[PDB]
């Protein structure tokens with residue numbers, strides 16, 4: 001009980017949840033984004049990332065930087081659609 | 093011409109022996125009581141009406157454009173796409189784009205701009221589905237103020253009916269082209 | 281609502297307070313992030329892009345003595361590429377980076393609420409005093425900067441398509 | 454007190470015969486341990502899967518989509534031949550369908566197997582609805598059995614069901 005208080009970064013809120021969905025403070029900068037916005041973002045990111053990955057699957061010795069960058073949207077789309085589900089069940 | 097009892101809505105029943113689904117609303121413009129396969133039960137009628145109006149507008153444009161292309165083609169397009177009609181013109185423009193003629197990027201420009209409008213309007217569909225003020229199809233684009241007040245009833249029903257007719261007509265046009273190779277005018 | 285896009289709801293973040301706010305955010309990019317940060321970015325881009333557009337036109341018209349020998353027939357991005365080797369672009373980068381470190385301090389102040397976005401207290405000739413004037417000149421700055429972003433994009437991409445600078449292009453087409 | 458299915462054994466306590474497709478058949482007593490509603494939903498889903506599977510095990514032997522004409526009449530060989538992209542699209546379609554089932558199971562209460570899919574409104578008449586519920590359960594059971602048999606027959610003979618019947622190689626030669 002004598003332990004020193006644990007320092008945490010500024011603006012650290014309580015994110016623990018036993019509800020159906022987290023509190024939308026889990027989504028940070030995107031907490032105020034709409035669920036429809038997240039859905040469209042996830043679909044667009046999935047399509048673009050899949051296309052840019054297919055444009056690089058037989059990787060050459062000089063891959064396109066824009067295709068490399070866009071391929072990171074397929075992993076991004078997963079988080080986007082998770083956020084979409086979170087934001088649909090939190091009222092938005 | 094809302095004519096809720098004559099041309100749309102209320103007891104209007106396309107199929108006398110089978111009643112319409114409970115989900116289908118009578119208040120929607122163009123309600124003849126037609127939904128035998130119960131699509132309205134499966135999907136939100138707001139989404140279906142947005143889709144119907146978008147399809148009707150695209151098909152009306154496509155039919156009018158097929159007629160216009162068959163009767164007239166702008167000065168110079170013949171140089172870039174030879175003689176091409178209907179979907180042949182689409183394929184020809186894409187072909188020339190691949191061939192490297194900079195003049196043949198019409199379809200790419202069309203896609204860019206139409207997709208820009210669709211991307212910026214998608215939130216409108218989401219807001220409509222989320223119980224927003226917007227009706228399924230109204231984009232508030234009435235510059236000339238043609239449909240204002242009394243006309244709205246007939247204008248909306250006319251839009252839907254002409255759009256359905258154009259949906260059928262453009263399909264007929266495209267398939268007649270695929271078989272005969274002619275245009276909407278050549279066939280007739 | 282949304283006067284700009286009449287078929288979309290007014291953006292939640294945008295209340296119409298800021299200059300040049302026509303409720304334009306169809307994709308909802310103001311919901312993500314802080315609107316002060318986005319306004320600082322917008323004014324940075326506005327000023328940079330309008331300087332860039334005026335510079336493109338002015339380089340097309342006039343060039344300083346002895347630059348023709350260094351750059352040859354290069355225009356626009358070709359001038360960039362040519363003078364990176366010479367070292368001009370490096371010196372510009374050094375000095376702009378100095379100014380931008382201090383602008384980093386300014387942005388950190390803005391996010392804390394101390395500084396209004398885009399306000400560096402740069403008014404030598406003293407144009408903006410009549411609070412009315414500054415209120416007009418702010419709207420004019422935003423509008424001209426937006427027009428200039430679009431204009432510089434058009435100039436650079438016209439150079440890409442044709443290889444001609446803005447006014448040289450406009451003369452012949 | 455006594456099971457209908459097994460007249461010489463006592464009726465399972467949870468299976469009182471009220472639920473559709475109940476004849477008191479539970480010799481190993483799954484209903485006592487596991488949640489009966491979950492079991493009913495699982496049975497209905499398996500029956501639907503196997504009804505479609507049994508139909509599609511034989512349909513390609515009668516007609517094929519023009520795109521997949523080359524693919525073998527053997528359903529397993531056709532599965533191998535389809536390729537990742539088409540299988541990925543089928544998987545996405547199935548997962549989109551199963552999102553609704555996920556919602557109805559974990560975040561909703563409803564009649565087992567009720568996902569709201571009744572576009573043709575064939576279930577409004579209560580008597581026809583009862584017959585259709587029992588018919589769905591029983592056709593699903595028969596399809597489960599038949600499709601398991603079909604999968605094993607295709608494994609053995611390396612041919613389609615109709616082809617196996619026509620060639621009359623009903624009997625095995627050993628393990629593959």
Ligand code: CLA
Nearest residue numbers: 598599600601602603605606609610617622623624625626
């Ligand atoms: C709809 C159900 C169905 C049908 C119509 C068929 C049809 C067929 N199967 Mg079978 N099969 C089925 C389900 C079915 N199967 C299932 C669910 C499995 C397990 C996954 C199998 C596993 C299987 C294998 C492994 C093989 C077949 C094979 C065959 C073929 C030859 C059968 C044969 O030789 O019978 C002979 C019949 C018997 C030996 C009868 C079993 C012996 C006991 C003593 C019978 C007891 C009778 C008793 C009264 C039953 C009820 C008692 C209870 C009420 C207390 C034939 C096309 C063969 C094949 O195609 O080879 C290429 C083959 O090798 N099947």
Ligand code: KC2
Nearest residue numbers: 343344345346347348349350351362363366367368369371
């Ligand atoms: C008014 C201000 C001014 C500016 C802002 C400016 C900017 C730049 C830049 C931009 C980054 C470059 C890259 C550049 C390059 C050269 N300048 Mg120049 N210059 C200015 C003034 C003069 C004057 C007065 C002279 C001169 C010259 C040269 C020569 C010589 C070439 C040679 O002789 O081989 C070269 C290579 C001399 C010359 O020859 O001019 C006929 C000369 O006398 N410059 N100069």
Ligand SMILES: CC1=C(C#C/C(C)=C/C=C/C(C)=C/C=C/C=C(C)/C=C/C=C(\C)C#CC2=C(C)C[C@@H](O)CC2(C)C)C(C)(C)C[C@H](O)C1
Nearest residue numbers: 330331333334403404405406424427428431434435438446
């Ligand atoms: C604030 C302040 C001060 C200051 C200051 C300063 C230095 C202010 C400088 C302001 C400037 C340089 C503004 C420039 C705006 C340029 C625009 C809008 C260009 C648009 C181009 C377009 C649309 C285009 C185009 C085109 C395209 C795309 C295609 C091309 O083929 C050609 C074409 C042309 C047709 C002072 C010094 C007074 C002191 C004061 O105490 C504080």
Ligand SMILES: CC1=C(C#C/C(C)=C/C=C/C(C)=C/C=C/C=C(C)/C=C/C=C(\C)C#CC2=C(C)C[C@@H](O)CC2(C)C)C(C)(C)C[C@H](O)C1
Nearest residue numbers: 504505507508571572573574575592595596599602603614
């Ligand atoms: C929900 C709903 C709808 C619906 C629907 C639909 C589409 C319903 C579809 C139902 C289907 C396709 C049912 C298929 C059942 C197949 C069975 C039972 C096969 C058994 C095979 C056996 C026993 C075998 C075998 C064999 C084996 C194993 C070995 C072989 O040697 C011999 C043999 C071949 C005999 C619609 C869309 C109308 C909407 C409406 O609002 C309600």
Ligand SMILES: CC1=C(C#C/C(C)=C/C=C/C(C)=C/C=C/C=C(C)/C=C/C=C(C)/C=C/C2=C(C)CCCC2(C)C)C(C)(C)C[C@H](O)C1
Nearest residue numbers: 151154178179180182183259260261262263264266267270
């Ligand atoms: C551009 C392009 C292309 C293209 C293309 C395009 C644009 C293709 C478009 C195809 C279209 C629009 C097809 C429409 C079919 C409509 C049917 C069958 C309606 C049936 C209605 C019935 C049966 C009604 C029945 C009845 C009902 C329901 C109600 C009342 C009574 C009645 C009305 C009789 C390609 C494909 C060539 C490729 C090319 O490389 C690029």
Ligand SMILES: CC1=CCCC(C)(C)[C@H]1/C=C/C(C)=C/C=C/C(C)=C/C=C/C=C(C)/C=C/C=C(C)/C=C/C1=C(C)CCCC1(C)C
Nearest residue numbers: 052053054055056057058059060063065067068069071072
């Ligand atoms: C500029 C400078 C001067 C002095 C000091 C200072 C630190 C400031 C320094 C700054 C340096 C900076 C900011 C460097 C930044 C560099 C960065 C971020 C480099 C990133 C490189 C990443 C690369 C290639 C990634 C390529 C990825 C590939 C192929 C992936 C492959 C694949 C893809 C894309 C899809 C299919 C699967 C497969 C084949 C595996």
Ligand SMILES: CC1=CCCC(C)(C)[C@H]1/C=C/C(C)=C/C=C/C(C)=C/C=C/C=C(C)/C=C/C=C(C)/C=C/C1=C(C)CCCC1(C)C
Nearest residue numbers: 458478503529532597598599600601602603604605607608
């Ligand atoms: C994943 C994979 C790996 C390798 C194979 C393959 C490529 C096909 C692929 C897929 C495999 C799949 C989907 C396999 C599925 C297997 C299936 C569905 C097997 C089914 C087995 C069914 C059996 C025994 C049923 C036995 C029924 C019995 C006694 C009934 C007896 C009864 C009678 C006679 C009277 C009344 C009482 C009672 C008990 C009902």
